[PDB]
Design a protein around this nucleic acid. Sequence first.
RNA 1: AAAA
Length: 89
Amino acid sequence: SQELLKDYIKRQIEYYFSVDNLERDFFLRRKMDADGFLPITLIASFHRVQALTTDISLIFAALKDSKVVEIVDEKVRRREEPEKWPLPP
RNA sequence: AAAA
């Protein structure tokens, strides 16, 4: 049903938090807090996520079992060494 | 928003 849409959401967000993307993604990194977190609502505004859903609860559901990204409350970060990535605001 |  929505299983395919959730897979697309998960994979897209896992790409944003990949090392390959992060190395050059200064916008994403300058929006991180000191722990590497971004609000999920910021990620939801990225155009490829908007190209899938505007349902925030579905995004949370899609990411619940991700090994690449860590969800903490309303926030998301790369699970591995998130502190490598923040940039000054 | 050259997959912020």
